[PDB]
């Protein structure tokens, strides 16, 4: 297995020093740089860039600049995804986002886990923990989502939350660590 | 009432899909883009842009780039306002800032509330909650101020605070959620 | 003593209005602007800018753009320092970073303390509190490190932490405020 | 009263040497420069600039470049205003323009009066004379409108006219000085 | 008949709102923009632009920038035409210029007539009145030539004239309105 | 005598076809182009350009862009000269401007006379008529000053005037042709 | 007669050394250069350039860059003309294109004939042979159409064809030289 | 089925007028434009663009500019593919290229078939015919490969060939139409 | 012998992998890139670039952009060489062009031979076959000339020809493969 | 007397700290910067810049870039002056150059004398010593001409000479200090 194959298989891999991964990250950084330096008025150019970044034809995916991503192609998007200013989709582990998702400003979706032992960490080792963002969700600003976390559909994450553990569907959750406050009435 | 008139009247309105509001936000983003790509050395140009953004002649309002705002004209500023790097004044609801205000880096002043029910939220509805920042205040870095909040004059907000509720005047407040620690002696 | 000499001596000084300090901060902002607008593909140019900023020849110091610093020359770096997107080293007070340090995205290392009394604060006064980051450490994203804090070698800071007080060596610490959870086994 | 307050109150004021007024004029010139150097093809950008200039969301206000204005914010516009090439709205005194107004090329709307005595004039003094342009009007090319003048609704100003005095509604006026020729039948 | 066909046939047509005409005017404004932003040193480039604008190979047609025209292709030129700074050939109605013509600065040749009744004018209606400029003529600066006017060959128009009616050949004409002063001796 | 020497001696000369004169005009057109494309914020650069254009160190000579001149070096300026938008100093004949002169927008100072006979005019012949603008004068916008004219010190020229003949000192003059209305009281 | 007048009258003319013709070709090269260096995203700018090039308001004429033409004003276009990458309309002789025409990539429509004798050719002489492209036609990629050739309406030209002679209407033609294979039923 | 789904399933589809397909072609055209305007010296940037175009990390795929492709993601490449100047991979139908392939200049790989009947063709209909290029092949310059064609591994295609039908493995084939001349000895 | 010496001696050489040859090809691609991005109006710059490419002072060598060559210095030219759009001189093997040569658009002069056996070809090996283009020749558009071919002086090559074998002097030759049609009367 | 008037009168003056002189030097530095950054191909632009610098229409004055001068207007030139690379005409004191003068590369013509006493020198004082270069002279490369020096007509200055004293006409002079070797026979 290559280091990219280990990353995708959710095994420990050399994220920091593998040339292939460093080069795939470069491609995403180059496209993000072009996007981040495109005037907000250049609508068609932004659409072309976001599509080249995610390697898909997006359906109403709005991104407020700046935007950051590690690979781009490891972000799976639904239709109607609203991403405010300064978001980072650290996608070594697949980041799945449903339909009708509101992501506030300064939010980070982190899939990278480093070893706690400095000997293994200094070697460049990481384990990718995929993130699942359900459809019909709302994230306040200044939210950090940690590796392996699943946010159930219809859920609301309060501003400043650090989502360390899975949040069930149709729930209002807030805090550092993020804890469920109450259920949400999502009936028609 | 237009959707802009409803926004200003603190009623539910279509923020995401009203053409007038999308276009007024475009103007603020275009000015913010010009500001964010102006060399720090270009003092006169930065002043011109800051003044075009807020639609006012500022009196010692220092903004460290990048800066973000939704409308610009809905940010009411006093004299001597020091804004560090990466701040966002989400101003659908008026953001009133007094005189002599120190705003640390990575701070967000959020006035947008979305419905908890995904059916109403997916339709683009929002309610604007104005923020009142008193004169003679200090905000640490990484602070998020939530809709409808009032921070009394002479108050100090600790770094990493999530201001969910009103802070009284001459108070030291810290945490997520932000709670008053003690009063401040603000005598000459 | 000049205001720069008082800053370095850890005495109260006019940070905001001293021309020399305003001008030394301008130099760092001009270099940061050049770096932040350099395509990720321009490897040699990025190395030259990073080195001009810190006034030293760096040994494997990776910086993901954007990056911010106040002086640049008051950041003392070890070898193998990995800095993710949107970090700010507010270095009025010296920021000492050891070898093999992983700094996540959206981290702020703040050394500036303003007076609590608005009369002294409005005059532009500040006191610089140096930060010591030990070797072999790991910082999650969205971390804020406060003035005067020391993070012991071999320590791990969880994502979203607000480091208000010193963290001992070989410790796992998380939260707002940042508290030690358990010790780390850092043996070979 | 500041010199800006005197200008707006229709009192004598230092237009030429007051720093605030020189700086507010700079902002309008900077926006006019950006507009005048924007390709005619850049429709969205021209709209953004026109809106930043007048500090309002215009409704079908077409401006053929070059355009000049002193303040921009002192030009009050109606919907459907068609401004041909090389027009100047010298707006120290408010310039009110109604709905459905056709302004030919090389037209000047001048609100500045200087003293006749050179001693007072050389000191920089001016008096602002607001201009009222009624709705449903038509201006030929090469027209100059002088301070304090009112052009009644439904009126037509012939090419090369120098409008020194008020023109009544529904009238055809031509010449240097501009004199009424006959009334206009403005029935459906 | 299309609105372009009505314009050319000297019938009332929608000049302001017909897409074809708006688009043909855009082409002329794009070429004029390129010409107006071409350094005077770039002789060959200026020649190419002038020729692309008029859709003809010009024979000693000198144009001092800025220059404006509505269509460009509706300006019929002779050889040796000297056009000074800031001229506008509003050519909805054909503008025929003979050989050896001296056009001073700030001259406007206007072929557009709007209805006097605001109801018809607000609908975008216009009637094109062709202008005939005879060979061997001289125009002073600040001259406005009105729709349907013919200036006979060998004639001289004084500076600041508003040419409302036809001028006979070999005549000296001045004023607002433009009136013949005396005949000119144009013998060898 | 060269054609430049004849121009300066107020004799008939080939203005249009002499290579030396065509080339001296090019230099002025190149400097005016640079000035006309300099952002209003670039104060020192504008000052350098105006100084290079007039071949002198100006003392408070304000020029609002665009500005046009034929030679530049044939414009003799006093201190405190305020030139509004779109002025043209056609300086084949020396244009002498005193101290404390207010020149409104769209003003033309024309020193070129062409022969009335088309045979001599088509050959490129011209006679330069110097213009003398007295100190302490005020020009309204849309004014044209004809060759050989002298405007006495302390005089005021109304907007839209065509100055065909000399105007005595301390006089208010208006119209096409420009005629004295009354004397001005210019006492302290 | 000027050299431009001789060119248009289908007479021998100095194409290579006449200043007027060299200058009219420069105008087309300058507009083509602007078009070839315009980002595909800049839709309105591309439309303005194509219209300035052909000296007409085009009706759904799509051009994939790069594009080349000698004069541009001697290309007469119909509505719905789809021109793929790297096409050259060498238009000294008028190039008439009908409505609904699909032109594949790397196609050349050449109207210039040089003399066979090198003495006359070295002097710069040429004769323009107009090309008529009928409405409702399809050209494969890598096709060269030679001077004086008429391609009848409803016809299909196979990829790699060298069209030396007239192709009748509603015909499928392929090869070097281009020969009719069969008729097309377009009813 | 969408028009993209029909294209991929090898069914008749609207290639010319489907918005999704027009937009996916735009993305490839934008990346090709960036590649075609990148200096040959910019090796890393060219590699990033080629990888963004094909949506894969290429292994020694050399491309000489200009290069054209319709989708980019429908070109499946092996390692060591050498593409000379002016090649076009019209990839509506998948273009599969093996390892060690030499493609000469001015080659076209066309997968688009239009209907012979003009009624269906004018409607925008097309059928995608995938092309299979075997490993270890060599294409001379000026080669056109037609829809549905398979070129067997170890084969050589002569310059100027029009490949209308399948070519067997280890064969030398030349002409318009392309016909096998002789077999190739491809032993070690 | 080096690989360059082997190339010039008409021996098998590592064309694709020799560092020196790769670097000399880079020089030719950099000059071709600069020339292909030079506006047609820039006559002297084009001349300088053409002369730098061929390493010679050309005498009436007109090249229509785009142009391509491998080395440039291996193309020997005569006087009066007219090269139309999109021509490629692949000159690892010397290309000799006499005087008075007309080369139509989309012509390729190919001197590269690859081995037929894929084992040797995959190793990067090539053999250069010089091409000799006699004086007084004419090439139609879409012509490919193959390695080692001589086209006799006074010859005419029909459009679309694939020149596989030598063409005698004073001959009309057309087709794929190119064959002589008749001799040419080349008398005065 | 102003400091510029003292400079021109050959009296001691504040060269380093007088604002007028610092600003007149800026104008020359700006024109030299534009000249030094103009491509050698831009012949007409170089001629315009050289003429703007010297404030005269030059007659065959060739200048190889870079070129430096302090004022430009204090360099009096004859016809046919050939200036090689890296020359500096330090012209506080008038530099008079005759006709037919060959100036080698890296030559300095210095007219500035500073006081020997550091007290007066540190105050910014200088005395301008004009340089007279006779017609028909030749300067080798690396020559320095000192203040007040006169080089007689027909003279030759050897490479590396430091001209401290006057050189008589028709003489060959070499060395540091420059001494006459022999007279030159300058007869027809």
Curated annotation (Swiss-Prot), chains A, B, C, D, E, F, H, I, J:
Keyword Acyltransferase found: yes
Positions in coiled-coil regions: none
Cited Pfam families: Hexapep, Hexapep_2, Mac
Gene3D superfamilies documented for this protein: Hexapeptide repeat proteins
CDD domains (UniProt xref): LbH_MAT_GAT
Keyword Amino-acid biosynthesis recorded: no
Keywords: Acyltransferase, Repeat, Transferase
SUPFAM superfamilies for this protein: Trimeric LpxA-like enzymes
EC main group: transferase
Recorded GO MF terms: galactoside O-acetyltransferase activity
Listed SMART domains: Mac (SM01266)
EC identifiers of the protein: 2.3.1.-
Family matches, as InterPro entries: Hexapep, LacA-like, Mac_dom, Trimer_LpxA-like_sf
Family under the similarity heading: Belongs to the transferase hexapeptide repeat family.
Protein name, per record: Putative acetyltransferase SACOL2570
Species this chain originates from: Staphylococcus aureus (strain COL)
